[model samples]
Target chain A: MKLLHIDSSILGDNSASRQLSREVVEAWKAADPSVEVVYRDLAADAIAHFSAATLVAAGTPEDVRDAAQAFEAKLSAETLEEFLAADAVVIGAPMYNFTVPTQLKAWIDRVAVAGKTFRYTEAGPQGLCGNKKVVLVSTAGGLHAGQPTGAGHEDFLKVFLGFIGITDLEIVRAHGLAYGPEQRSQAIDAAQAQIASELF
Target chain B: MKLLHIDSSILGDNSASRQLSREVVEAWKAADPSVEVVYRDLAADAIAHFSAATLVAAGTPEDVRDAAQAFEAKLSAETLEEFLAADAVVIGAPMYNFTVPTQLKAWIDRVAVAGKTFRYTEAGPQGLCGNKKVVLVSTAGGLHAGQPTGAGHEDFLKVFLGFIGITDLEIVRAHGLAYGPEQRSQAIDAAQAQIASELF
Candidate 1:
């Protein structure tokens, strides 16, 4: 089995999502020693946001494309390759305001390509990356659980993943970290427990 | 009244979201000569991903904090100030994959701060930035309208804005642009008409 681990937190040592994702991956690695782990640290090596060049690359046939356009196309290719090759994907995402960080989002842009990740038909939008497990490890400062404030970020992630055909998604959220130490500890513990059971 | 125009598309000229947002703002300016428009292209001036240093700056007391931390804190502050100062916010966002672009997400992270953008009390999460109207102009490649895939992105944005206290939000979505040029033109025209009647 192959496990892809993506960490988006720029906080090297102090990110709750990073800590929880590490725990999940550690457990997964322990369970399957043969599992090949692919790591992408988007914060350190930022993914390029989609541009006119990228759009052209997406449309351009592989044969006629120049070296630069070909290289840009490779970005999407690498991300899609990782998604297809991996049996499972673990994402460490920090909630900014009410959504995932841009670096993480940029990576999403690369992977969610037409005819590559999803397709459209008479029935509806069909997701190509199906039957794979996606584990999202998220950390938030505020507790917006049932409120309107919390709705946008989490739902966006879930639905986006679902659209691409990954229905089996387990989200481990560590929230209220910005509240204080006590709230942070409780949130982390809750998230860790969920990760152990759902992800591992 | 001042209008803040934020565009997150990495595509310079070919971006549908950018074109729509520009049209919206231009029309608004044409109709109302007194409204000042402040433009910020997040892709051009990308904010650094949140770091431990950034978090510390967020939590630390200004008087006791170091100059560097203070400076870092100022970045978020400035972004929030821009949001607060605006009477209307015009956001041009591309649905990268199935959600907003990373640059836009980064701006959301910076502006949606505790005690500044929102607050938590016994009543649940209450928004602070009230009475201001927000015009969300988005372009999506797929036709996700009324489908499960479509709901996620729209719901998230609505909830996030509501969480921060901006209750009056008009969403003008140009979907199915990837279908072909005819569909794209029709969608854009429909969205523009909606914006004209509802907002401008």
Candidate 2:
């Protein structure tokens, strides 16, 4: 199995999400030694946000499109190819002001292309990236469980992933880090334990 | 009164959110000639992602902090000062993959500091940036209205702004742009008209 691990935290060593994501990938590697993993660190090199040229390229046929459109379209193609090539996708994201970090969001803009990840129907939006398992590893500064504050990021991710046909998703949240070191450690430990069990 | 108009859309000219935001700002300029408007185009000069260094600096005391910490912490300070000083903040954000554009999210990260924007008391999270008004000018391509997919970005912004004591938020949405050019134009025009009547 091919596994794709994407990390968005700019904190290379100190990020809870990055730590938990590594643990999840390690657990998976231990379970399946033959599995090859491709790691994409978005913070190290941020992805370009979507543009009109890119959108047009996505909608228009390549044979008749302008050079700018065709070149911009390569971003979508590369991102989609990576996603499709992977069997399981692991994402390490931090909650920034009650939402996903900007780097991660930019990566989403690159990959969530029409006709690739989703399609519009008369009934509603339909997801195309099915038959793949997804693991969303997130870390937040405060405990917002069961509150309105907690609903936005988690629900958005779940809904968007489902919209793209990736319904089989597991979200591991490590929150309350800004509370103190003790809470941070506890949250990380709990998330690591959960990841171990889920992966194995 | 000063207004800081921030446009986070990657699309410079073709963005619906950008057009509406410009319209709102133009109206503001016309309504109040003395009001100084500062424009920050985040799409052109994206802010650096928050690193561990930044998080530490943000949490540390200013008296004994290193020069780098002092400098990195300035981003937060500037954001808070701007928010506190401005009579109005007009943000032009595009919904990317079901949430606010990454650049806008980055700007939020800079401003939503603990002591500056919000505080946690024994009661709960309390907002500190009170008595200010925020106008979120957003454009979404998909017809997510009244559906599960539609509320993600707007709801997140409203709740986050409220969390920081900016409860008086006016959300002007230009939605259904993904439908076609006509629908997009109509949505933007409606939002522009509303801004002129209610806000400008």
Candidate 3:
């Protein structure tokens, strides 16, 4: 009954990812009236970029138990807790230069704790956070998915998400916005349908 | 010759990427006394994450620009110029959660200007900033590099760099740091040889 809604689009109202994310959250709301929603607009107020202060705080929160460290450590702890508390995560991730925006990456840096999200083993690393579902709204300017140039950029999301233990990811993608004016609407319409069907 | 040396590791001194980056810059300075080094420590001070204000001010310095917007815009503008002025870029990138740190990504967000780094064409997108060599010193705790889980993460740096028009790329990788204490020293030793040959 709890959903964490995160938006990383700087475009705000003009962002396809934002629109689709709203559609997704609205659908979830309509489906269940008692759903609790937590909102984080990264474009408006992005989590501060990760620093040494945060790196120390991620694992050794008690080691740097001071006044200066408390501010950053507290914020990061809250963000991680918010993510852990959610049953599902709804992300509005806009592609930039073949990958998610820096705003989104900063959020990832905040939550991707080594012992908390994953751990190293003889077999390699294993994901620790495995119970939640992620519904992603991804927007791109052109048709890059499945293309050679776009392959690595797009896979970063799935690979990293799976690494963190959130494997149940369903992307509602809207591409070809830069193809032309006509493709923008067509892409948006397709995204709307995908959001309606897959998100529901 | 002028060079830009950027470090993204939160570990200021103990980081393998930082150590190699220092060695690379030091060796370059040793070989050529005239090498002007522009140092940007993303760990010391991360570039602010992207926002509506920063995005708008990246191009138009005149309209809707406030005092804070001017500050961020000026910093971003200078960073862009620093990149363009550099004959080569040497980055110390430590892998966290399968990709470059968000601090580094924030720098990319600032400098990856549309008209400045890339442009739209009749055929497709084109990288405007070209001709610079990029040497990346990559460090990972686990044996992710060259592995299936690590391939996509490593390719992201290449794809985005290519998108921004910097095509001549090389990587000095040090993986398997988490396997054992022996691997750390072995990793560092291998990295030293790579840096000695590939960098110089």
Candidate 4:
């Protein structure tokens, strides 16, 4: 099995999501030794924001595309291809300003392409990646789970993942990290325990 | 009064939000010629995604900061300053994958600072920019208003704006752009009418 492990936290060593996501990947590997993991550090190697250039590049034919256009097209193609190839994915998503970080959102913009991951039918939209399993390492500074404050963070992730036809999803959340040292430690510990129990 | 006009659509001329936001700004200017509009084209001059480098730069002292760190600090300062100076704001926000575009989200990351925009109090989070009025030119390809699909788009915007102490918020919505030509025309027309009626 191929597992894509993505870390989008800007906190680096201080990132709870990154630490938890790494543990989740390790546990997954320990559970199944055959699982091959591919990693992408979004903060270290950020994806450019989806722009008009990207749309033009996508529409332009391969033979006639310019350098910049080719780069945009190739980036989209590779990002989407990697996502499609993964049997499972572990997303280290940290909440920034009541939503996922812009880097992760940029990655999402690349992968959620029409005619590739989704399609519009007469009935409605249909997802093409129902086979993939996903685990979200969600970390926040405040207690926002099941609250309106989290509508754009965990809730948004759920909606997007469901829209793409991924039904088998798990979220290991660590909140109140900004409260204090003890609170941060306790939150992370609970999340790690959840990851161990639910993932493996 | 100063007004910050932001356009984040990657569609360029094809963007309904951009057209509507421009019209909204024009109407505001017409209503009050004193309205000083400062434009920020998020798609054209996109802000880099906030990263670990950004955090490190923020923590580093100015005299000892490196070139890249200086750039990061300057970007954050300017972005936040522009937002702070605005008496009102017009955001041309288009929804992609049930959320605001990544470019807009990047801008939000820079401006939603701890000491500037909000502060955590013993009571809870306290907003600092309650005096500003905001007009959101919300455009989407599908009908998501008051639905689960919109929880991450307009709803998220409301939550964030409220968190930063914005109470006077208006939304000019244009939906069903991908439905058909007639539907697109109708939706935009309605949004333009709403902009004229509500913004002035």
Candidate 5:
């Protein structure tokens, strides 16, 4: 019933990821009008990038933490709490120079905390957060989703989400925008079809 | 004989990536002792994170562009130049979540320019900068180097640099650090051996 929508495009209205994500959200809303949505535009309302204080925040004594470090730790805690509370998460991950925007990566830093989403074990690391639906709206300028040359963003996003325990993941990708309108239009149509089928 | 050393770890001396990167640089210097090193500490001397203004900088008329945007564009070009001039690049990339630190990502955002490092082509994207070596010192707390969950950073870094025609990449990985002392010591020793062999 609760959905968190995170947009990381600096392009605002002109972003393909934002456009596709909005369509997905709209479809979800039409399917269930009762669905509650929370929107956070990461670029417009940027979260603070990671600082040195972040690394020592956990180890340092609470009373001795610098005011700035304390503030950042508190902010990260809030970010994680929002993620834990969400039933579904819709992310607008636009490819910027072959990967996700720094804005989205900054958000990930706050949420991917140890002992909260994952834990270390004798065998290996285990993910604690699972059983959630994660829908990724991926938009790229070139055809690199399936291609070997420029596939880092798509690959990274999928693997990163799975690491955090969201195995029920779906990606609606629209690539090759820079190629031309025909290539762009086809990818968009394909993505729209995926969105429509997923919601309906 | 020329090296560009970039460090993104914010933990100062406590960073594993930084430690390994230093070793790599030391090995390079020790191998020749004449290697000229240029160090760019991304955290201590941070660049502006990508902004909305960055999107429209190219389109914005030079006369009308704000001083800040103009300055950022210039700095990005300089960053690219430093990269271009280096015979070998050594990067200290600590895993913040599932990928490279945002600080390292920020540097990538600047240097991995479209026309500069790569170009659009009818067949696909073509990389322009080549014939150089790249060494990434990747540090992670858990064992994510070969694992599906934690391998995003390594995979992404490899693909990203390759996308720019720098396919000759060598990664010195020290993972599973927080697992225990034995795991930590083993990885460090292995990384040290890798550095010694690759350089000498």
Candidate 6:
């Protein structure tokens, strides 16, 4: 099995989601030694935001495209290819201004291409990646779970994943990190325990 | 009054949101000739996504910071300062994969700094920008205003704005652009009429 491991936290070693996601990856490997993992550090090697140039590059003929256009086209192609090849994905996403980091969003923009991940029908839009599984490692500084505050981050992730046909999804959430040291530790410990015991 | 005009659409002149947002700014100028305007094209001149380097730059002593750190710190300070100085803001936000563009999210991250835009109190996080007004030009390819599809984009924007103490908010919506040429024109026409008649 091929697993794609993604991290978008800006805190580096201090990031709760990054640590939890690493633990989760380790647990996954322990559970099944045959699994092959591909790692992507979004904050470290960031993807360029999708722009007019991106669209133009994709439309331009390869031989005729300029260097900038070629780079944009290749970036989109490789990013999408990596995502499509993965059987399962573990995403380490943290709340930034009540939403996913812009880096992660850029990654999403690359993979959410029409006709590849989803398509419009007479009925409605239909997702194409129904075979994939997703484990979202969600982290936040505040207690926003089940609240409107979480809607933009966790809830948005759910919506985006579901739209891409990822129904076999699990969310490992850790919140209230900014509350206090005790609460932060408690949250992390609980998440780690959950990852060890519950995740496959 | 000073108005900050932001267009985040990648479609350039062909973008409905960009067109509508420009019209909104023009109408505002016509209504109040004394109003000064500042424009930011998120697609043309995109902001860098927030990352680990961004935090380090902010925490580093100004004189001792390296060139990269200094640049990051300056970007954050100037971006936040611009938002703080604005009396009103006109945001042209198009729905991309059911959410705001990564470029626009980058801009949000820069301005959503703690202590400046918000503060944590015994009552919870309180927003400080209560005196500002916002006009969001929301555009979509499909009709998603009341559906689950709109939750991540328009709904998320509403929640974010409200959290920042922006109660004087106006949304000018145009959707169903991808339906057909007729539908696209109709949608744009309706949005234009709304801006001309209602917006200040």
lDDT of 6 by residue, B12-127 (tens): 77889998999999999999999999998988988888888888899899999999999899999989999999999999999998899988888998988779888878888788
Off by over 4 Å in 5: A58-67, A121-124
lDDT of 6 by residue, A1-200 (tens): 89999999989879899999998899999999999999999899999999899999999999999999999999999999999999999999999888899889999999998899998788988899999989999999999877777777888888899898888998898999988999999999999888988886
**Residue-level lDDT tens digits of model 1 in B119-149:** 8777766888897888898788887655555
What's the CA error at residue A83 for candidate 4, in Å? 0.7
Q: List the residue pairs that clash in candidate 2.
A: B141-B178
In order, the TM-score of chain B in each prediction is 0.91, 0.89, 0.92, 0.98, 0.93, 0.98
What does the interface RMSD come to for each candidate? 2.8, 2.3, 2.0, 0.8, 1.9, 1.0
For model 4, how does the per-residue alpha-carbon lDDT over B1-200 read when each residue is reduced to its tens digit?
Answer: 99999999998888899999999999999999988999999999999889888988999999999999999999999999999999999999999988999999999989899889999888988999999999999999999888877888988998899999998898888999989999999999888778767556
Query: Which one is best on DockQ?
Result: 4
| lDDT, each prediction | 0.81, 0.80, 0.81, 0.91, 0.82, 0.90
- Model 2: per-residue lDDT, tens digit, B9-74? 877777888888888888888998898998888777676666566788977999979999998888
Query: What is each candidate's fraction of native interface contacts (fnat)?
Result: 0.63, 0.55, 0.65, 0.76, 0.56, 0.63
lDDT of 3 by residue, A1-200 (tens): 78999998988778888888988999989988899999998878778777887766655646657765776788788888898788889999888766788788778877887677778777867887788888988889878787655644557778888888887889888898977889999999998888777667
User: What is the Cα-based lDDT of residue B26 in candidate 4?
Assistant: 91
TM-score of 4: 0.98
Query: If the candidates were sorted by their TM-score against the true structure, best first, what order would they fall in?
Result: 4, 6, 3, 5, 2, 1
Off by over 4 Å in 2: A49-77, A121-124, B52-80, B120-124
Q: Which stretches of candidate 1 lie over 4 Å from their true place?
A: A56-74, A120-124, A142-148, A176-183, A194-200, B11-14, B52-78, B119-126, B143-147, B179-182, B195-200
- Estimate the overall C-alpha local distance difference test score of candidate 3: 0.81
In terms of docking quality, model 1 is acceptable
- With a 3 Å backbone cut-off (N, CA, C), the pairs that clash in candidate 6 are none
Residue B162 in model 3: lDDT: 85
Number of the predicted model whose lDDT against the real structure is largest:
4
Tell me how each candidate scores on DockQ against the true complex. 0.47, 0.47, 0.62, 0.84, 0.58, 0.75
Q: Rank the candidates by lDDT, best first.
A: 4, 6, 5, 3, 1, 2
Clashing pairs in 4: none
Q: After aligning candidate 6 to the native by TM-score, how far in Å is the CA of B58 from where it should be?
A: 0.8
**Ordering by DockQ:** 4, 6, 3, 5, 2, 1
